[PDB]
């Protein structure tokens, strides 16, 4: 919808 | 509704010439209340009740005088619902959520303290816009991040999000990464402070990992305490 799901997935990836 | 702790004795009758006060705090639709039970264990009636709060970290103060028309007789117990607001005088307290109180009747004045659970200070308009969340999480210094273990919680992500939303902690995004659920959450206090959270849930671990970012990181431990209470209850 707002397109931001990919940015949240990248944020999550960066912290695992 | 939101989480409400069971009433605890704040003023025991042994310390207050027969007056016992038990209490808790509620917050329904933004209205904060101190919900108390006053019991007269003594042999004389009690009248002329009033209450005062000392200045405190979040400026909590009663909205009205105490609601008590008639004498509280020996062995009688009454329920008292005291509306509060956060427009009062501010002084930093230790612990941060400590509230000093004076209650008087016709016999004496009695001073006591109690702890305000921080969740009753979570406002309804605490859902951060997504773009703003990403920018704020990046912008808040990484040295402000504090992590906590929520131990022996095994609720699934959907249940966690629902319980938290009922307490004005909003889930902004949920991602699954390397087989782990990552919940990105926001909440806002009555004094304008935002707290951002990442909650990590795995198959395997018994404990969830809560990471909190806040520009005033002193509040983070108190947020953890109430996360833990909400999810355990």
PDB file of C-alpha atoms in Angstrom:
ATOM      1  CA  UNK A   1       0.000   0.000   0.000  1.00  0.00           C
ATOM      2  CA  UNK A   2       2.436   2.757   1.137  1.00  0.00           C
ATOM      3  CA  UNK A   3       5.238   0.724  -0.440  1.00  0.00           C
ATOM      4  CA  UNK A   4       7.234   0.683   2.802  1.00  0.00           C
ATOM      5  CA  UNK A   5       7.102  -3.039   3.582  1.00  0.00           C
ATOM      6  CA  UNK A   6      10.443  -3.580   1.841  1.00  0.00           C
ATOM      7  CA  UNK A   7      12.059  -0.848   3.997  1.00  0.00           C
ATOM      8  CA  UNK A   8      10.737  -2.502   7.136  1.00  0.00           C
ATOM      9  CA  UNK A   9      12.034  -5.884   5.922  1.00  0.00           C
ATOM     10  CA  UNK A  10      15.457  -4.342   5.331  1.00  0.00           C
ATOM     11  CA  UNK A  11      15.443  -2.845   8.808  1.00  0.00           C
ATOM     12  CA  UNK A  12      14.596  -6.231  10.307  1.00  0.00           C
ATOM     13  CA  UNK A  13      17.284  -7.943   8.173  1.00  0.00           C
ATOM     14  CA  UNK A  14      19.926  -5.429   9.282  1.00  0.00           C
ATOM     15  CA  UNK A  15      19.397  -6.325  12.954  1.00  0.00           C
ATOM     16  CA  UNK A  16      19.277 -10.145  12.772  1.00  0.00           C
TER      17      UNK A  16
ATOM     18  CA  UNK B   1     -10.074  -2.991  27.840  1.00  0.00           C
ATOM     19  CA  UNK B   2      -6.583  -2.117  29.020  1.00  0.00           C
ATOM     20  CA  UNK B   3      -4.666  -3.858  31.781  1.00  0.00           C
ATOM     21  CA  UNK B   4      -5.654  -2.865  35.335  1.00  0.00           C
ATOM     22  CA  UNK B   5      -3.585  -4.149  38.247  1.00  0.00           C
ATOM     23  CA  UNK B   6      -5.505  -5.636  41.214  1.00  0.00           C
ATOM     24  CA  UNK B   7      -6.031  -3.104  44.015  1.00  0.00           C
ATOM     25  CA  UNK B   8      -3.081  -2.945  46.462  1.00  0.00           C
ATOM     26  CA  UNK B   9      -3.060  -1.519  49.991  1.00  0.00           C
ATOM     27  CA  UNK B  10      -1.578   1.976  49.759  1.00  0.00           C
ATOM     28  CA  UNK B  11      -2.450   3.092  53.307  1.00  0.00           C
ATOM     29  CA  UNK B  12      -2.922   0.317  55.891  1.00  0.00           C
ATOM     30  CA  UNK B  13      -5.310   0.933  58.779  1.00  0.00           C
ATOM     31  CA  UNK B  14      -2.471   0.312  61.263  1.00  0.00           C
ATOM     32  CA  UNK B  15      -0.695   3.378  59.941  1.00  0.00           C
ATOM     33  CA  UNK B  16      -3.791   5.612  59.652  1.00  0.00           C
ATOM     34  CA  UNK B  17      -5.877   5.356  62.819  1.00  0.00           C
ATOM     35  CA  UNK B  18      -8.228   2.822  61.286  1.00  0.00           C
ATOM     36  CA  UNK B  19      -8.506   4.144  57.719  1.00  0.00           C
ATOM     37  CA  UNK B  20      -7.455   1.644  55.039  1.00  0.00           C
ATOM     38  CA  UNK B  21      -7.076   2.704  51.404  1.00  0.00           C
ATOM     39  CA  UNK B  22      -6.567   0.169  48.624  1.00  0.00           C
ATOM     40  CA  UNK B  23      -6.158   1.403  45.058  1.00  0.00           C
ATOM     41  CA  UNK B  24      -5.385   1.037  41.389  1.00  0.00           C
ATOM     42  CA  UNK B  25      -5.260   3.169  38.254  1.00  0.00           C
ATOM     43  CA  UNK B  26      -7.453   2.839  35.150  1.00  0.00           C
ATOM     44  CA  UNK B  27      -7.495   4.520  31.870  1.00  0.00           C
ATOM     45  CA  UNK B  28     -10.552   4.134  29.665  1.00  0.00           C
ATOM     46  CA  UNK B  29     -10.803   6.222  26.500  1.00  0.00           C
ATOM     47  CA  UNK B  30      -8.109   8.630  27.641  1.00  0.00           C
ATOM     48  CA  UNK B  31      -9.703   9.342  31.037  1.00  0.00           C
ATOM     49  CA  UNK B  32      -7.337   8.406  33.825  1.00  0.00           C
ATOM     50  CA  UNK B  33      -8.773   7.425  37.229  1.00  0.00           C
ATOM     51  CA  UNK B  34      -7.417   6.563  40.637  1.00  0.00           C
ATOM     52  CA  UNK B  35      -9.883   3.887  41.747  1.00  0.00           C
ATOM     53  CA  UNK B  36      -9.853   3.368  45.496  1.00  0.00           C
ATOM     54  CA  UNK B  37     -11.635   1.548  48.278  1.00  0.00           C
ATOM     55  CA  UNK B  38     -11.720   3.349  51.672  1.00  0.00           C
ATOM     56  CA  UNK B  39     -12.501   1.159  54.700  1.00  0.00           C
ATOM     57  CA  UNK B  40     -13.133   2.391  58.265  1.00  0.00           C
ATOM     58  CA  UNK B  41     -11.827  -0.303  60.700  1.00  0.00           C
ATOM     59  CA  UNK B  42     -12.049   2.073  63.682  1.00  0.00           C
ATOM     60  CA  UNK B  43     -14.772   2.757  66.287  1.00  0.00           C
ATOM     61  CA  UNK B  44     -15.561   6.324  65.292  1.00  0.00           C
ATOM     62  CA  UNK B  45     -17.038   7.699  62.085  1.00  0.00           C
ATOM     63  CA  UNK B  46     -14.877   9.458  59.503  1.00  0.00           C
ATOM     64  CA  UNK B  47     -15.791  12.651  57.622  1.00  0.00           C
ATOM     65  CA  UNK B  48     -14.237  15.705  55.893  1.00  0.00           C
ATOM     66  CA  UNK B  49     -12.194  13.674  53.408  1.00  0.00           C
ATOM     67  CA  UNK B  50      -9.809  15.445  51.014  1.00  0.00           C
ATOM     68  CA  UNK B  51      -6.749  14.420  48.972  1.00  0.00           C
ATOM     69  CA  UNK B  52      -3.662  16.219  47.571  1.00  0.00           C
ATOM     70  CA  UNK B  53      -0.877  15.015  45.278  1.00  0.00           C
ATOM     71  CA  UNK B  54       2.676  16.297  45.472  1.00  0.00           C
ATOM     72  CA  UNK B  55       4.237  17.477  42.219  1.00  0.00           C
ATOM     73  CA  UNK B  56       5.369  14.519  40.195  1.00  0.00           C
ATOM     74  CA  UNK B  57       7.212  13.543  37.026  1.00  0.00           C
ATOM     75  CA  UNK B  58       4.186  13.534  34.685  1.00  0.00           C
ATOM     76  CA  UNK B  59       2.196  16.321  36.338  1.00  0.00           C
ATOM     77  CA  UNK B  60      -0.610  14.072  37.528  1.00  0.00           C
ATOM     78  CA  UNK B  61      -3.231  15.804  39.640  1.00  0.00           C
ATOM     79  CA  UNK B  62      -6.870  15.200  40.601  1.00  0.00           C
ATOM     80  CA  UNK B  63      -9.474  16.812  38.357  1.00  0.00           C
ATOM     81  CA  UNK B  64     -12.060  17.153  41.139  1.00  0.00           C
ATOM     82  CA  UNK B  65     -12.267  17.136  44.947  1.00  0.00           C
ATOM     83  CA  UNK B  66     -12.853  13.787  46.617  1.00  0.00           C
ATOM     84  CA  UNK B  67     -16.439  12.460  46.217  1.00  0.00           C
ATOM     85  CA  UNK B  68     -17.732  11.754  49.803  1.00  0.00           C
ATOM     86  CA  UNK B  69     -21.071  13.166  51.028  1.00  0.00           C
ATOM     87  CA  UNK B  70     -21.849  11.263  54.206  1.00  0.00           C
ATOM     88  CA  UNK B  71     -19.809   9.842  57.126  1.00  0.00           C
ATOM     89  CA  UNK B  72     -17.943   6.591  56.596  1.00  0.00           C
ATOM     90  CA  UNK B  73     -19.117   4.573  59.591  1.00  0.00           C
ATOM     91  CA  UNK B  74     -17.320   1.854  61.554  1.00  0.00           C
ATOM     92  CA  UNK B  75     -16.841  -1.295  59.439  1.00  0.00           C
ATOM     93  CA  UNK B  76     -18.117   0.418  56.259  1.00  0.00           C
ATOM     94  CA  UNK B  77     -16.236   0.330  52.950  1.00  0.00           C
ATOM     95  CA  UNK B  78     -16.840   2.672  49.972  1.00  0.00           C
ATOM     96  CA  UNK B  79     -15.551   2.720  46.381  1.00  0.00           C
ATOM     97  CA  UNK B  80     -14.117   6.094  45.289  1.00  0.00           C
ATOM     98  CA  UNK B  81     -13.380   6.962  41.642  1.00  0.00           C
ATOM     99  CA  UNK B  82     -11.075   9.980  41.364  1.00  0.00           C
ATOM    100  CA  UNK B  83     -10.563  11.471  37.899  1.00  0.00           C
ATOM    101  CA  UNK B  84      -7.025  12.696  37.173  1.00  0.00           C
ATOM    102  CA  UNK B  85      -5.347  14.786  34.522  1.00  0.00           C
ATOM    103  CA  UNK B  86      -1.759  15.537  33.522  1.00  0.00           C
ATOM    104  CA  UNK B  87      -1.876  19.357  33.567  1.00  0.00           C
ATOM    105  CA  UNK B  88      -0.449  19.754  37.051  1.00  0.00           C
ATOM    106  CA  UNK B  89       2.907  20.863  38.447  1.00  0.00           C
ATOM    107  CA  UNK B  90       5.974  18.819  37.476  1.00  0.00           C
ATOM    108  CA  UNK B  91       8.867  17.595  39.591  1.00  0.00           C
ATOM    109  CA  UNK B  92      11.102  14.647  38.709  1.00  0.00           C
ATOM    110  CA  UNK B  93      10.569  11.762  41.157  1.00  0.00           C
ATOM    111  CA  UNK B  94      12.526   8.619  42.043  1.00  0.00           C
ATOM    112  CA  UNK B  95      11.398   6.138  41.046  1.00  0.00           C
ATOM    113  CA  UNK B  96      10.180   8.051  38.039  1.00  0.00           C
ATOM    114  CA  UNK B  97       6.587   6.904  38.542  1.00  0.00           C
ATOM    115  CA  UNK B  98       6.366   7.603  42.274  1.00  0.00           C
ATOM    116  CA  UNK B  99       3.392   9.602  43.469  1.00  0.00           C
ATOM    117  CA  UNK B 100       3.331  11.214  46.945  1.00  0.00           C
ATOM    118  CA  UNK B 101      -0.188  11.622  48.358  1.00  0.00           C
ATOM    119  CA  UNK B 102      -1.804  13.168  51.437  1.00  0.00           C
ATOM    120  CA  UNK B 103      -5.299  12.115  52.477  1.00  0.00           C
ATOM    121  CA  UNK B 104      -7.075  13.698  55.403  1.00  0.00           C
ATOM    122  CA  UNK B 105     -10.303  13.140  57.313  1.00  0.00           C
ATOM    123  CA  UNK B 106     -11.616  14.671  60.534  1.00  0.00           C
ATOM    124  CA  UNK B 107      -9.163  12.655  62.631  1.00  0.00           C
ATOM    125  CA  UNK B 108      -5.790  13.388  60.978  1.00  0.00           C
ATOM    126  CA  UNK B 109      -3.761  13.733  57.793  1.00  0.00           C
ATOM    127  CA  UNK B 110      -1.966  10.698  56.383  1.00  0.00           C
ATOM    128  CA  UNK B 111       0.866  10.662  53.861  1.00  0.00           C
ATOM    129  CA  UNK B 112       1.727   7.730  51.577  1.00  0.00           C
ATOM    130  CA  UNK B 113       3.221   6.954  48.231  1.00  0.00           C
ATOM    131  CA  UNK B 114       2.219   4.694  45.342  1.00  0.00           C
ATOM    132  CA  UNK B 115       3.490   3.914  41.878  1.00  0.00           C
ATOM    133  CA  UNK B 116       1.608   5.005  38.750  1.00  0.00           C
ATOM    134  CA  UNK B 117       1.828   2.240  36.129  1.00  0.00           C
ATOM    135  CA  UNK B 118       3.080   3.906  32.989  1.00  0.00           C
ATOM    136  CA  UNK B 119       0.421   2.360  30.772  1.00  0.00           C
ATOM    137  CA  UNK B 120      -2.269   4.596  32.168  1.00  0.00           C
ATOM    138  CA  UNK B 121      -0.174   7.476  30.696  1.00  0.00           C
ATOM    139  CA  UNK B 122      -0.161   6.004  27.138  1.00  0.00           C
ATOM    140  CA  UNK B 123      -2.338   8.253  24.960  1.00  0.00           C
ATOM    141  CA  UNK B 124      -4.838   7.141  22.392  1.00  0.00           C
ATOM    142  CA  UNK B 125      -3.039   9.023  19.579  1.00  0.00           C
ATOM    143  CA  UNK B 126       0.157   7.023  19.782  1.00  0.00           C
ATOM    144  CA  UNK B 127       0.204   5.361  16.347  1.00  0.00           C
ATOM    145  CA  UNK B 128       3.246   6.723  14.479  1.00  0.00           C
ATOM    146  CA  UNK B 129       3.057   7.126  10.690  1.00  0.00           C
ATOM    147  CA  UNK B 130       5.247   4.521   9.012  1.00  0.00           C
ATOM    148  CA  UNK B 131       7.567   6.914   7.165  1.00  0.00           C
ATOM    149  CA  UNK B 132       8.071   8.870  10.399  1.00  0.00           C
ATOM    150  CA  UNK B 133       8.826   5.625  12.301  1.00  0.00           C
ATOM    151  CA  UNK B 134      11.581   4.653   9.881  1.00  0.00           C
ATOM    152  CA  UNK B 135      13.099   8.115  10.008  1.00  0.00           C
ATOM    153  CA  UNK B 136      12.830   8.284  13.825  1.00  0.00           C
ATOM    154  CA  UNK B 137      14.319   4.817  14.388  1.00  0.00           C
ATOM    155  CA  UNK B 138      17.312   5.838  12.214  1.00  0.00           C
ATOM    156  CA  UNK B 139      17.541   9.322  13.782  1.00  0.00           C
ATOM    157  CA  UNK B 140      17.417   8.315  17.469  1.00  0.00           C
ATOM    158  CA  UNK B 141      21.030   7.470  18.416  1.00  0.00           C
ATOM    159  CA  UNK B 142      21.810   3.741  18.607  1.00  0.00           C
ATOM    160  CA  UNK B 143      23.267   4.365  22.078  1.00  0.00           C
ATOM    161  CA  UNK B 144      19.712   5.109  23.270  1.00  0.00           C
ATOM    162  CA  UNK B 145      18.560   1.596  22.350  1.00  0.00           C
ATOM    163  CA  UNK B 146      17.876  -0.641  25.337  1.00  0.00           C
ATOM    164  CA  UNK B 147      16.978  -4.362  25.146  1.00  0.00           C
ATOM    165  CA  UNK B 148      14.953  -6.516  27.501  1.00  0.00           C
ATOM    166  CA  UNK B 149      13.939 -10.120  27.763  1.00  0.00           C
ATOM    167  CA  UNK B 150      10.244 -10.781  28.219  1.00  0.00           C
ATOM    168  CA  UNK B 151      10.586 -14.202  29.834  1.00  0.00           C
ATOM    169  CA  UNK B 152       8.246 -17.187  29.530  1.00  0.00           C
ATOM    170  CA  UNK B 153       5.787 -15.543  27.150  1.00  0.00           C
ATOM    171  CA  UNK B 154       4.581 -17.896  24.392  1.00  0.00           C
ATOM    172  CA  UNK B 155       1.672 -15.932  22.903  1.00  0.00           C
ATOM    173  CA  UNK B 156       1.695 -15.715  19.132  1.00  0.00           C
ATOM    174  CA  UNK B 157       2.262 -12.430  17.301  1.00  0.00           C
ATOM    175  CA  UNK B 158      -1.408 -11.715  16.627  1.00  0.00           C
ATOM    176  CA  UNK B 159      -2.324 -12.086  20.295  1.00  0.00           C
ATOM    177  CA  UNK B 160       0.588  -9.928  21.411  1.00  0.00           C
ATOM    178  CA  UNK B 161      -0.406  -7.170  18.937  1.00  0.00           C
ATOM    179  CA  UNK B 162      -4.034  -7.242  20.068  1.00  0.00           C
ATOM    180  CA  UNK B 163      -3.284  -7.086  23.813  1.00  0.00           C
ATOM    181  CA  UNK B 164      -0.844  -4.275  23.235  1.00  0.00           C
ATOM    182  CA  UNK B 165      -3.258  -2.315  20.996  1.00  0.00           C
ATOM    183  CA  UNK B 166      -5.867  -2.536  23.778  1.00  0.00           C
ATOM    184  CA  UNK B 167      -3.323  -0.642  25.882  1.00  0.00           C
ATOM    185  CA  UNK B 168      -2.539   2.033  23.246  1.00  0.00           C
ATOM    186  CA  UNK B 169       0.693   0.399  22.017  1.00  0.00           C
ATOM    187  CA  UNK B 170       0.313   0.225  18.258  1.00  0.00           C
ATOM    188  CA  UNK B 171       1.835  -2.209  15.807  1.00  0.00           C
ATOM    189  CA  UNK B 172       3.095  -0.202  12.806  1.00  0.00           C
ATOM    190  CA  UNK B 173       4.592  -3.145  10.871  1.00  0.00           C
ATOM    191  CA  UNK B 174       5.123  -6.863  11.168  1.00  0.00           C
ATOM    192  CA  UNK B 175       7.842  -8.663   9.220  1.00  0.00           C
ATOM    193  CA  UNK B 176       8.998 -12.296   9.239  1.00  0.00           C
ATOM    194  CA  UNK B 177      12.760 -12.603   8.787  1.00  0.00           C
ATOM    195  CA  UNK B 178      14.848 -15.799   9.155  1.00  0.00           C
ATOM    196  CA  UNK B 179      11.724 -17.445  10.601  1.00  0.00           C
ATOM    197  CA  UNK B 180      11.204 -14.832  13.309  1.00  0.00           C
ATOM    198  CA  UNK B 181       8.372 -12.335  13.707  1.00  0.00           C
ATOM    199  CA  UNK B 182       9.513  -8.721  14.071  1.00  0.00           C
ATOM    200  CA  UNK B 183       6.886  -6.336  15.370  1.00  0.00           C
ATOM    201  CA  UNK B 184       7.537  -2.602  15.071  1.00  0.00           C
ATOM    202  CA  UNK B 185       5.505  -0.635  17.608  1.00  0.00           C
ATOM    203  CA  UNK B 186       4.876   2.917  18.868  1.00  0.00           C
ATOM    204  CA  UNK B 187       3.330   4.570  21.868  1.00  0.00           C
ATOM    205  CA  UNK B 188       3.226   8.113  23.174  1.00  0.00           C
ATOM    206  CA  UNK B 189       3.075   9.386  26.790  1.00  0.00           C
ATOM    207  CA  UNK B 190       0.830  12.148  28.096  1.00  0.00           C
ATOM    208  CA  UNK B 191       3.864  14.459  28.192  1.00  0.00           C
ATOM    209  CA  UNK B 192       4.615  14.003  24.482  1.00  0.00           C
ATOM    210  CA  UNK B 193       7.448  11.475  24.693  1.00  0.00           C
ATOM    211  CA  UNK B 194       7.439   8.806  21.954  1.00  0.00           C
ATOM    212  CA  UNK B 195       8.788   5.331  22.503  1.00  0.00           C
ATOM    213  CA  UNK B 196       9.527   3.101  19.550  1.00  0.00           C
ATOM    214  CA  UNK B 197       9.803  -0.670  19.932  1.00  0.00           C
ATOM    215  CA  UNK B 198      10.880  -3.769  18.111  1.00  0.00           C
ATOM    216  CA  UNK B 199       9.523  -7.016  19.546  1.00  0.00           C
ATOM    217  CA  UNK B 200      11.217 -10.230  18.330  1.00  0.00           C
ATOM    218  CA  UNK B 201       9.321 -13.544  18.550  1.00  0.00           C
ATOM    219  CA  UNK B 202      10.860 -16.914  17.587  1.00  0.00           C
ATOM    220  CA  UNK B 203      10.018 -20.559  17.431  1.00  0.00           C
ATOM    221  CA  UNK B 204      12.752 -21.988  19.712  1.00  0.00           C
ATOM    222  CA  UNK B 205      13.137 -19.247  22.343  1.00  0.00           C
ATOM    223  CA  UNK B 206      10.902 -19.007  25.460  1.00  0.00           C
ATOM    224  CA  UNK B 207      11.666 -15.333  25.757  1.00  0.00           C
ATOM    225  CA  UNK B 208      10.708 -12.467  23.463  1.00  0.00           C
ATOM    226  CA  UNK B 209      13.310  -9.748  22.878  1.00  0.00           C
ATOM    227  CA  UNK B 210      12.045  -6.176  23.290  1.00  0.00           C
ATOM    228  CA  UNK B 211      14.211  -3.344  21.988  1.00  0.00           C
ATOM    229  CA  UNK B 212      13.200   0.173  22.911  1.00  0.00           C
ATOM    230  CA  UNK B 213      14.304   3.497  21.418  1.00  0.00           C
ATOM    231  CA  UNK B 214      13.436   6.732  23.116  1.00  0.00           C
ATOM    232  CA  UNK B 215      15.001  10.180  23.206  1.00  0.00           C
ATOM    233  CA  UNK B 216      14.615  10.000  27.016  1.00  0.00           C
ATOM    234  CA  UNK B 217      15.962   6.464  27.645  1.00  0.00           C
ATOM    235  CA  UNK B 218      15.372   6.720  31.419  1.00  0.00           C
ATOM    236  CA  UNK B 219      11.702   5.871  30.754  1.00  0.00           C
ATOM    237  CA  UNK B 220      12.552   2.613  28.922  1.00  0.00           C
ATOM    238  CA  UNK B 221      12.789   0.330  31.988  1.00  0.00           C
ATOM    239  CA  UNK B 222       9.307   1.443  33.095  1.00  0.00           C
ATOM    240  CA  UNK B 223       7.914   0.702  29.609  1.00  0.00           C
ATOM    241  CA  UNK B 224       9.452  -2.777  29.802  1.00  0.00           C
ATOM    242  CA  UNK B 225       7.759  -3.359  33.178  1.00  0.00           C
ATOM    243  CA  UNK B 226       4.350  -2.623  31.796  1.00  0.00           C
ATOM    244  CA  UNK B 227       4.960  -4.612  28.520  1.00  0.00           C
ATOM    245  CA  UNK B 228       5.729  -7.522  30.750  1.00  0.00           C
ATOM    246  CA  UNK B 229       2.600  -6.977  32.857  1.00  0.00           C
ATOM    247  CA  UNK B 230       0.318  -6.629  29.824  1.00  0.00           C
ATOM    248  CA  UNK B 231       1.651  -9.785  28.111  1.00  0.00           C
ATOM    249  CA  UNK B 232       1.604 -11.904  31.304  1.00  0.00           C
ATOM    250  CA  UNK B 233      -1.975 -10.831  32.146  1.00  0.00           C
TER     251      UNK B 233
END
